[PDB]
């Protein structure tokens, strides 16, 4: 990750377990019998001015879309993962600090929120510096944290859901930047000692349970703690040597074929 | 390990370093003192090492003057062997045969005629010296 | 770092590298400055003096009235002065002996020239294709296949070199060698065959030390390096002892049944027994007779100088000193256990510490720890004399070491301790303006508190003393979870820092506050638990109204009160306050939560779920779900916005407000 | 040698007389072992500071051996103080946390006052319904 | 084998580390505790450290930090530089 | 798995096989520390076990090992070879009392003399600035009464 | 005499941080090195303070509160070596030899190392060693050829002879 | 006294990261012991810390020296090693 375990909050990717059909109904935008946002563009529409805007809107989604396909292609199905800096919260409370309800439409501009990020994701650096190519380890040492910030701050999102204004948004992207760099671990430090200790406590919590009471059982048998030593000892004789093999199907998805 | 006399031999660092001259050394010392006095309350213990030097230095003023030293420098030139140099300007007098005796390391280092010429210039410089 | 007789002299420069070498007879002799000819020394001169070659010369002193020339004073500050113990009787050496035995075939006797040739270019090259201290494997393999020599070195023939010559073959010249060896008890035996005319197998035939050493010393210098040896640190010719060194008493022990008596250890003693067996062997040098019987006593030095190292080298020696019991060797102390290693180098007791039974207290801030005066009156905690202290700091001394706000000891320039006790107890002795003075402890004043067994990062975290009475450690209930230990009469240790540079570490990094969230799980590790928790529920209910009558009373905890009395939720006939109202008071301003539990509707539907706004709850009911180490836990959420404190105050408010509510609400089963 | 006595509490017999208020590192017996002004040693036993209180009684008899033989016993009342252990007969290991005077405690309504009061959370998890029944 | 690094081309993080704060405050503490030239208007304190903290807040405290790299090179940072 | 898949493969195997040890059920998991244990195991090729002693390695001299216990032999053997210990160790280090590189000991400190030098003014001048006759028989004058230095030295 | 570069560490104390440390460090240096002597470099006549004074470092001490300031300086030193010919100043004259004196170092000319032409005269007004018109009293710089030098306790001591040609009275 | 600072215990400072607390509660608050080491062969000298007399009857040293902080704990071991004919040379900084 690059971050200090201790400053982190499991988070959720709205943009994942979503049907493509509803995905489009959250981020994508067009002039095709739509133009519903103009009802929010208040105050000030343009309107539509000259190109540019129409173009930013499909370019945002080119990348918000290269993120929907990958993941997956990497993550099984789960969605809850632990990231640094609770974003889902910096926005509430944030709609407490400034409030403003649907009645007040956004004093923002689609050409700002998109610059907003690009300027304040590139402020989230943890590997310094450039030193060309050394900017690569960094571009994707925060790549995950990144797809969040294009999913909870992509355009249609900030005007349909939770209308923001220059001041609010400017302050949101404030805390993020700050809470991020305040979450970068070390140097120091001792990441093994502390980590090792935490790994020991967990085992102790299992050992007992894996035995507690507790039967009595069959198949899949293996046990916990009592096994640990087996793994660390890489010993050949590991009681339950088990091994799980999957299939296709076919074969199979049936049964009698299996 | 290394406790000879030579013949130019002994410590490497010391060998590398250049042996300061007597008169010139004293001049530099004097200069140093003048720079220190530049803002002194008065006193500045000279310990015991100072006294001795102050005497030996004055009792060997082979150039009781600020220019004498420069003249000497002008006269010299070719390094040869820092040691030998400072040694020749610290002894003085006079003939070749004598030079070798004092500094056997000079063996086939330098000729004679030249040496004699240098001695004559020094003898006249000592005073001269005015 | 403290003081140590303002040694000054040799600046300081901490140890940077550690060079592990192999003592050498020559060096051992030089280093030592004593003799040691009175084997059965022990001041056995007929009086209570000493000499010559045991106690005195010099050695390092053993009591006060003694300035053992060479340094001092005593008993400390004066390290032991090692010394040689001649010999003149080729002695063995178990330990290093094992290795020397394995070698056999690394030079061949006596020409002393590496076995390999060139060579055989693979064998020799292969052995080198491995870092030092390992190539041994190759040597051993060659010895097992060796047992004969050849021509004579690689001397041209034909003679040449440009670039030659090769010209060689092989492995020098001589013969051998030719006889292997095996280990039987504490003796070496080997057979000598060829053959087919007369030889010997495995039955007898020993060797000796003087012979081996001689061969080694002959070893070629470019050869000493060819193997895992060091022609500067480790030299085979060193494996054999000759000047056996003698450690200073400082390393040994003594005793004195004061009076009449003063036996020693024990131990050592044996050392004297060995010189007894050496001096009786050295004097016979002029003989001669019986000669063959003289070796029988020589075998005894082979055993004693071993028992001194490895009591039981797996041979069946006994090494009985008193009542047939192993003779406390040197290898015994090292790797006990029950000694150094894991007792004198890893886990060392320590000082400036204390421990006692713990007790609960609901009235201390989280980062607070009740320290009984009994202890506070015995700690410290030096503290140099600042120009800011002189007056304040002086009052302490003039007070006394028996009055909490007092001190013990006053340290001066020279390094002299003016014990405030019986010693001082007077002498205005104003107070220098650069010296040091040791005070009692008073007000956080941080100090670190742990619980054996300390698994988690936070079994040692740092509190702020002060200072209560009664002889236990009062600590804060919400801090009990991290110490996985109740009040079953448990003990917990306290370690007080001294230097003002650690006082800083355990304040800025380690602190009950900055430790309320271990990264083990990026989840909190402390939370509202026990009675204050049971209480929250039974009070966060919207069935519980508060009489105007207090409210008031309970508002005196917060502890940082706006001063403003909360706007009443009920203006009907009586003025009433909801239990949620005044509770949401002790939560920070501007933290949001949308808990959304299982069944939950646009409705209430029935205090189900939980949800806070501008630091005020409005929805559902507080329980462990939210004021315990939960994931998106309320405890987690202000920590983490906005850091410990008012964060640290959260535990002080609820754990103070509610306890206060519960006091007059009563609860039981 | 021996300081921080005081031996001012020993009789002519070199032994203490009950029941002399003994505290601190006070001493109670005195020894001596030969070796100007020489020589008397001191192999006498003091009293661990951690203890206090008076002296019940001492018993001086003879051993064989063939010399004298003394035994000293001192009593030291001990009151309950915060931090002492108590437990019922069901494994409710408890320790004292506080000592409230009579008024504070829930005088009710008979009205008596609890002599000690344990907390309800030491029930449901340690299931010890016997403590209740009793 | 050191190497020293350019006060102009610094690599490491511009912010001051959890551990450093702890070491600096530890270091000045001892300094002041040892009667030393205090670099900010004395608020009227007593605690050689609680004072050092007054300094840190105002970034008016000497001491610099040499950050050794694995290479063997280092970087020097000024308390006023750091964050 | 190391013999028949990848070495990278086998790391993932550990990570997975450790999760399945401490998770069922309800267990304090952090992907970070789990991650680290694995990389340590599969970071030198072969599968370095962690038996009661500490990865049966040997590349940081003895001094260090002597800490993992049991000492003895180690020193009795390493001694016969003069094994240099860069003492870059952390237990080797807490053995000598030198300050250990434990995070907050993994850096040194100096002094920003620069700040103390240029440090804010400064408010007065000039008389007293460059004088020398208010009692001290000796004289001065700031430093420009007609005198040099070097030059002569160079000659 | 030599002009060389030497090193020396100054361990300063918090009390003297002020704003003019540079001066303090320099003042402390002059005091610790000037007048000292070593076998390695000999007598440290004086330090060429100014211009030729480098002040590197420094790193404060962990458990001490003192900072170590390394200093590189130019100094005038007087180191003697066996075989060197020097002019000396006779101080005393006893039937034991000649107690000369060169600068700050003391040179002893054993009587056994003096020509057989210089008989010792104790009756003469002031004990001297004449011959041989040439009269060497407590006031006549002589020329000697260092035969051997020694260094016991930073201090240096060697013996000179008068056996070679062109040595003796000056 | 005293108390007891377990292996367990020490492994926990390291987790936080307290170089100085650690060093304080092991090489100061228990065995505050200082010794003087020869720069060539790193061993105990004939030190006096009074008359500035150090000297070395072996390496023949009298000018080249350095000081070291070690626990009398350490001290013993190095000494106990001398009896086993092995020399832990404490080659300090450049003083090597
Ligand atoms: Mg229990
Ligand atoms: Zn001694
Ligand atoms: Zn041979
Ligand atoms: Zn030495």
From Swiss-Prot, chain A:
Self-association state and partner proteins as the record states: Component of the RNA polymerase II (Pol II) complex consisting of 12 subunits.
Where is the protein found, in the record's own terms? Nucleus
| PTM note | The tandem 7 residues repeats in the C-terminal domain (CTD) can be highly phosphorylated. The phosphorylation activates Pol II. Phosphorylation occurs mainly at residues 'Ser-2' and 'Ser-5' of the heptapeptide repeat. The phosphorylation state is believed to result from the balanced action of site-specific CTD kinases and phosphatase, and a 'CTD code' that specifies the position of Pol II within the transcription cycle has been proposed.
Q: What does this protein do?
A: DNA-dependent RNA polymerase catalyzes the transcription of DNA into RNA using the four ribonucleoside triphosphates as substrates. Largest and catalytic component of RNA polymerase II which synthesizes mRNA precursors and many functional non-coding RNAs. Forms the polymerase active center together with the second largest subunit. Pol II is the central component of the basal RNA polymerase II transcription machinery. It is composed of mobile elements that move relative to each other.
Q: Which family does it belong to?
A: Belongs to the RNA polymerase beta' chain family.
What is the organism field in this record?
Schizosaccharomyces pombe (strain 972 / ATCC 24843)
The beginning of the lineage is:
Eukaryota, Fungi, Dikarya, Ascomycota, Taphrinomycotina
Q: What is this protein called?
A: DNA-directed RNA polymerase II subunit rpb1
Signal sequence region: none
Swiss-Prot record, chain B:
This entry carries the following GO cellular component terms, namely:
nucleus; RNA polymerase II, core complex; RNA polymerase II, holoenzyme
Report whether Nucleus shows up as a keyword of the record: yes
Record localization: Nucleus
Does the record carry Nucleotide-binding as a key word? no
Question: What is one GO biological process annotated to this record?
Answer: transcription initiation at RNA polymerase II promoter
What Pfam families does this protein's entry cite?
RNA_pol_Rpb4
Supply the alphabetized keyword list: DNA-directed RNA polymerase, Nucleus, Transcription
Give the residue spans that cross the bilayer. none
Single GO MF annotation: nucleotide binding
Biological function: DNA-dependent RNA polymerase catalyzes the transcription of DNA into RNA using the four ribonucleoside triphosphates as substrates. Component of RNA polymerase II which synthesizes mRNA precursors and many functional non-coding RNAs. Pol II is the central component of the basal RNA polymerase II transcription machinery. It is composed of mobile elements that move relative to each other. RPB4 is part of a subcomplex with RPB7 that binds to a pocket formed by RPB1, RPB2 and RPB6 at the base of the clamp element.
Q: How does it assemble?
A: Component of the RNA polymerase II (Pol II) complex consisting of 12 subunits. RPB4 and RPB7 form a Pol II subcomplex.
Q: Which family does it belong to?
A: Belongs to the eukaryotic RPB4 RNA polymerase subunit family.
Q: What is this protein called?
A: DNA-directed RNA polymerase II subunit rpb4
UniProtKB/Swiss-Prot annotation, chain D:
Q: Which domain of life is it from?
A: Eukaryota
Q: Where in the cell is it found?
A: Nucleus
Q: What else is known?
A: The binding of ribonucleoside triphosphate to the RNA polymerase II transcribing complex probably involves a two-step mechanism. The initial binding seems to occur at the entry (E) site and involves a magnesium ion coordinated by three conserved aspartate residues of the two largest RNA Pol II subunits.
Instruction: Summarize the subunit comment.
Output: Component of the RNA polymerase II (Pol II) complex consisting of 12 subunits.
- Name the family: Belongs to the RNA polymerase beta chain family.
Q: What does this protein do?
A: DNA-dependent RNA polymerase catalyzes the transcription of DNA into RNA using the four ribonucleoside triphosphates as substrates. Second largest component of RNA polymerase II which synthesizes mRNA precursors and many functional non-coding RNAs. Proposed to contribute to the polymerase catalytic activity and forms the polymerase active center together with the largest subunit. Pol II is the central component of the basal RNA polymerase II transcription machinery. It is composed of mobile elements that move relative to each other.
Q: What is this protein called?
A: DNA-directed RNA polymerase II subunit RPB2
Q: Which organism is it from?
A: Schizosaccharomyces pombe (strain 972 / ATCC 24843) (Fission yeast)
> Its gene?
rpb2
Curated annotation (Swiss-Prot), chain G:
| One GO term of the biological process aspect | positive regulation of translational initiation
The record lists the membrane-crossing segments as none
**Physiological role:** DNA-dependent RNA polymerase catalyzes the transcription of DNA into RNA using the four ribonucleoside triphosphates as substrates. Component of RNA polymerase II which synthesizes mRNA precursors and many functional non-coding RNAs. Pol II is the central component of the basal RNA polymerase II transcription machinery. It is composed of mobile elements that move relative to each other. RPB7 is part of a subcomplex with RPB4 that binds to a pocket formed by RPB1, RPB2 and RPB6 at the base of the clamp element.
Q: Which GO terms describe its cellular component?
A: cytosol; nucleus; P-body; RNA polymerase II, core complex; RNA polymerase II, holoenzyme
Write the protein's name: DNA-directed RNA polymerase II subunit rpb7
What the entry lists under Gene3D superfamilies is as follows: Nucleic acid-binding proteins, RNA polymerase Rpb7-like, N-terminal domain
* Molecular function, one GO term: single-stranded RNA binding
Which cellular compartments is it found in?
Nucleus
Kindly state which keywords UniProt assigns to this record, in alphabetical order: DNA-directed RNA polymerase, Nucleus, Transcription
PANTHER family recorded for this chain? DNA-DIRECTED RNA POLYMERASE II SUBUNIT RPB7, DNA-DIRECTED RNA POLYMERASE II, III
Subunit (UniProt): Component of the RNA polymerase II (Pol II) complex consisting of 12 subunits. RPB4 and RPB7 form a subcomplex that protrudes from the 10-subunit Pol II core complex. Interacts with seb1.
Principal location listed in the UniProt entry: nucleus
Q: Which family does it belong to?
A: Belongs to the eukaryotic RPB7/RPC8 RNA polymerase subunit family.
């Amino acid at each position: 990750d690059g971050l200090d375990a201790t400053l982190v909050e499991y988070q959720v990717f709205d943009s994942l377990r979503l049907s493509t059909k509803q995905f489009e109904k959250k981020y994508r935008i067009d002039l095709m019998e739509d133009r519903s946002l103009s009802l929010y563009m208040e105050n000030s529409i343009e309107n539509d001015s000259s190109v540019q805007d129409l173009l930013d809107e499909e370019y945002t989604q080119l990348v918000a879309d290269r993120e929907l396909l990958c993941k997956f292609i990497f993550p099984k199905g789960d969605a809850r993962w632990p990231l640094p800096v609770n974003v889902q919260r910096i926005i509430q409370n944030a709609l407490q600090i400034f409030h403003l309800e649907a009645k007040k439409p956004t004093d923002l501009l689609p050409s700002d929120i998109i610059n907003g990020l690009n300027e304040l994701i590139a402020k989230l650096t943890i590997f310094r510096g450039s030193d060309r190519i050394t900017r690569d380890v960094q571009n994707n040492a925060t790549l995950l944290f990144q797809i969040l910030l294009r999913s909870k701050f992509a355009v249609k999102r900030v005007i349909m859901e939770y209308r923001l204004n220059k001041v609010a948004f400017e302050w949101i992207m404030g805390e993020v930047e700050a809470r991020f760099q305040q979450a970068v671990v070390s140097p120091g430090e001792m990441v093994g000692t502390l980590a090792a200790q935490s790994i020991g406590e967990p085992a102790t919590q299992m050992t007992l349970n894996t035995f507690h009471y507790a039967g009595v059982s069959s198949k899949n048998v293996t046990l916990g703690v009592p096994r640990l030593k087996e793994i660390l000892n890489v010993a050949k004789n590991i009681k339950t040597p088990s091994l799980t093999i999957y299939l296709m199907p076919w074969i199979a998805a049936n049964m009698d074929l299996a | 390990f290394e406790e000879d006399a030579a013949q130019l031999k002994l410590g490497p660092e010391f060998e590398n370093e250049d042996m300061l001259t007597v008169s010139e050394a004293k001049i530099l010392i004097e200069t140093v003192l003048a720079q220190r006095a530049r803002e002194t309350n008065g006193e500045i213990p000279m310990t015991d090492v100072m006294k001795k030097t102050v005497a030996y230095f004055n009792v060997f003023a082979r150039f009781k003057t600020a220019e004498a030293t420069y003249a000497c420098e002008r006269i010299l030139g070719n390094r040869f062997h820092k040691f030998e140099r400072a040694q020749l300007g610290t002894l003085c007098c006079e003939d070749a045969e004598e030079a070798r005796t004092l500094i056997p390391s000079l063996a086939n280092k330098i000729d004679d005629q030249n040496l004699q010429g240098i001695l004559d210039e020094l003898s006249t410089l000592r005073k001269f010296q005015d | 770092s403290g003081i140590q007789f303002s040694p000054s002299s040799v600046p300081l420069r901490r140890v940077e590298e550690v060079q592990f070498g192999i003592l050498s007879p020559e060096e051992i002799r030089s280093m030592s400055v004593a003799k040691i000819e009175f084997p059965e020394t022990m001041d056995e001169s007929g009086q209570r003096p000493r000499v010559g070659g045991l106690l005195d010369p010099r050695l390092g002193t053993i009591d006060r009235q003694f300035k053992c020339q060479t340094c001092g004073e005593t008993m400390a500050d004066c390290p032991g002065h090692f010394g040689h113990i001649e010999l003149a009787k080729p002695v063995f050496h178990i330990g290093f002996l094992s290795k020397i035995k394995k070698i056999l075939e690394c030079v061949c006797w006596n020409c002393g020239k590496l076995k390999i040739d060139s060579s055989n270019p693979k064998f020799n090259d292969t052995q080198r294709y491995r870092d030092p201290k390992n190539r041994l494997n190759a040597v051993w393999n060659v010895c097992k296949t060796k047992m004969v020599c050849d021509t004579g070195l690689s001397a041209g023939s034909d003679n040449f070199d440009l670039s030659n010559p090769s010209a060689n073959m092989g492995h020098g010249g001589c013969g051998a060698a030719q006889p292997t060896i095996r280990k039987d008890g504490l003796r070496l035996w080997g057979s000598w065959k060829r053959g087919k005319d007369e030889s010997d197998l495995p039955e007898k035939r020993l060797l000796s030390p003087l012979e081996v050493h001689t061969i080694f010393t002959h070893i070629s210098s470019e050869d000493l390096a060819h193997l895992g040896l060091n022609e500067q640190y480790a030299r085979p010719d060193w494996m054999i002892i000759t000047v056996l060194p003698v450690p200073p008493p400082s390393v040994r022990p003594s005793i004195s049944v004061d009076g009449t008596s003063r036996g020693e250890d024990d131990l050592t003693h044996k050392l004297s027994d060995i010189i007894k067996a050496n001096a009786n062997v050295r004097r016979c040098e002029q003989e001669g007779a019986p000669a063959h019987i003289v070796s029988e006593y020589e075998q005894l030095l082979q055993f004693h100088v071993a028992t001194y190292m490895d009591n039981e080298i797996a041979g069946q020696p006994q090494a009985l000193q008193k009542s047939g019991r192993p003779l406390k060797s040197i290898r015994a102390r090292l790797k006990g256990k029950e000694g150094r290693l894991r007792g004198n180098l890893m886990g060392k007791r320590v000082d400036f510490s204390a421990r006692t039974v713990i007790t609960g207290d609901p009235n201390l801030s989280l980062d607070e720890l009740g320290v009984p005066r009994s202890i506070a009156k015995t700690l410290t905690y030096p503290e140099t004399v600042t120009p800011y202290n002189i007056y304040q700091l002086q009052e302490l001394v003039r007070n006394g070491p028996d009055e909490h706000p007092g001190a013990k000891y006053i340290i001066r320039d020279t390094g002299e301790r003016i014990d405030l006790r019986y010693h001082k107890r007077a002498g205005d002795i104003p107070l220098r303006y650069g010296w040091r003075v040791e005070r009692h402890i008073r007000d956080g004043d941080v100090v670190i508190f742990n619980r054996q067994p300390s698994l988690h990062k936070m079994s040692m975290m740092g509190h702020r003393i002060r200072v209560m009475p009664y002889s236990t450690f009062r600590l804060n209930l919400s801090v009990t979870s991290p110490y996985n230990a109740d009040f079953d009469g448990d003990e917990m240790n306290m370690h007080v820092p001294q230097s003002e540079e650690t006082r800083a570490e355990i304040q800025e990094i380690t602190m009950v506050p900055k430790q309320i969230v271990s990264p083990q799980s990026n989840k909190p590790v402390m939370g509202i638990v026990q009675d204050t928790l049971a209480g929250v529920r039974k009070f966060s209910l919207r069935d519980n109204f508060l009489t105007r009558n207090a409210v008031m009373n309970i508002m005196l905890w917060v502890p940082d009160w706006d001063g403003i009395l909360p706007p009443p939720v009920i203006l009907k006939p009586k003025v009433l306050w909801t239990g949620k109202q005044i509770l949401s008071l002790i939560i920070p301003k501007g933290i949001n939560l949308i808990r959304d539990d299982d069944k939950q509707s646009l409705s209430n539907p029935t205090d189900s779920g939980m949800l806070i706004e501008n630091g005020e709850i409005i929805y559902g009911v507080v329980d462990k779900k939210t004021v315990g180490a939960s994931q998106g836990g309320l405890v987690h959420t202000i920590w983490k916005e906005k850091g410990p404190e008012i964060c640290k105050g959260f535990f002080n408010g609820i754990q103070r407000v509610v306890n206060y509510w519960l006091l007059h609400n009563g609860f039981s089963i | 040698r021996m300081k921080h006595g005081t031996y001012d509490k020993l009789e002519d017999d070199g032994l203490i007389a009950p029941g002399t208020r003994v505290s601190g590192e006070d001493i109670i017996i005195g020894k001596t072992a030969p070796i100007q002004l020489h020589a008397k040693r001191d192999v006498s036993t003091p009293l661990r500071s951690t203890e206090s209180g008076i002296v019940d009684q001492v018993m001086v008899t003879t051993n064989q051996e063939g010399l004298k033989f003394v035994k000293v016993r001192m009593r030291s009342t001990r009151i309950p103080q915060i931090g002492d252990k108590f437990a019922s007969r069901h494994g409710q290991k408890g320790t004292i946390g506080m000592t409230y005077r009579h008024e504070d405690m829930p005088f009710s309504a008979q009205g008596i006052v609890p002599d000690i009061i344990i907390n309800p959370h030491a029930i449901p998890s340690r299931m010890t319904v016997a403590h209740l029944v009793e | 084998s050191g190497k020293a690094v350019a006060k102009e081309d610094r690599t490491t993080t511009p912010y001051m580390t959890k551990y450093e704060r702890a070491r600096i405050l530890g270091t000045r503490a001892l300094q002041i505790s040892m009667n030393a030239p205090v670099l900010v208007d004395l608020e009227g304190e007593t605690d050689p450290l609680q004072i050092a903290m007054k300094e840190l807040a105002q970034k008016k405290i000497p001491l610099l930090v040499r950050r050794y790299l694995p290479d063997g090179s280092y970087e020097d940072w000024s308390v006023a530089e750091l964050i | 798995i190391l013999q028949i898949l990848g070495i990278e493969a086998t790391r993932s195997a550990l990570l997975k096989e450790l999760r399945n040890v401490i998770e069922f059920d309800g267990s304090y998991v952090n992907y970070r520390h789990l991650a680290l244990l694995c990389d340590v195991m599969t970071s030198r090729g072969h599968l370095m076990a962690i038996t009661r002693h500490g990865i049966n390695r040997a590349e940081t001299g003895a001094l260090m090992r002597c800490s993992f216990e049991e000492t003895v032999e180690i020193l009795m053997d390493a001694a016969a070879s003069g094994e240099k210990d860069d003492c870059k160790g952390i237990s080797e280090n807490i053995m000598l009392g030198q300050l250990a590189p434990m995070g907050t000991g993994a850096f040194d400190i100096y002094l920003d003399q620069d700040m103390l030098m240029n440090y804010s003014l400064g408010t007065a001048v000039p008389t007293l600035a460059g004088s020398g006759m208010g009692t001290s028989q000796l004289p001065e004058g700031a430093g420009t009464p007609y005198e040099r230095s070097p030059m002569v030295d160079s000659g | 005499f030599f002009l060389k570069e030497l090193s020396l560490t100054i361990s300063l104390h918090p009390s003297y941080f002020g704003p003019r440390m540079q001066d303090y460090l320099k003042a402390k240096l002059l005091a610790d090195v000037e007048g000292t002597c070593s076998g390695q470099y000999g007598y440290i006549i004086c330090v060429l303070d100014s211009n030729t004074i480098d002040i590197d470092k420094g790193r404060v001490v962990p458990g001490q509160g003192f900072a170590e300031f390394e200093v590189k300086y130019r100094a005038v030193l007087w180191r003697p070596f066996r075989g060197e010919v020097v002019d000396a100043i006779v101080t005393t004259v006893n039937k034991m030899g000649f107690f000369a004196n060169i600068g700050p170092l003391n040179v002893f000319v054993s009587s056994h190392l003096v020509p057989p032409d210089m008989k010792f005269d104790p009756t003469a007004n002031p004990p001297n060693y004449s011959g041989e018109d040439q009269v060497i009293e407590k006031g006549s710089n002589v020329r000697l050829k260092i035969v051997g030098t020694r260094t016991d306790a930073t201090e240096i001591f060697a013996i000179a002879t008068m056996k070679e040609d062109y040595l003796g009275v000056l | 006294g005293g108390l007891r600072f377990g292996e367990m215990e020490r492994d926990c400072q390291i987790s936080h990261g307290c170089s100085s607390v650690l060093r304080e509660r092991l090489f100061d608050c228990s065995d505050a012991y200082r010794v003087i080491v020869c720069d060539i062969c790193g061993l105990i000298a004939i030190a006096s810390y009074k008359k500035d007399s150090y000297e070395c009857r072996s390496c023949q040293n009298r000018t080249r020296f350095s000081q070291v902080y070690l626990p009398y704990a350490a001290k013993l071991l190095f000494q106990e090693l001398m009896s086993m004919n092995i020399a832990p040379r404490l080659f300090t900084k450049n003083h090597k």
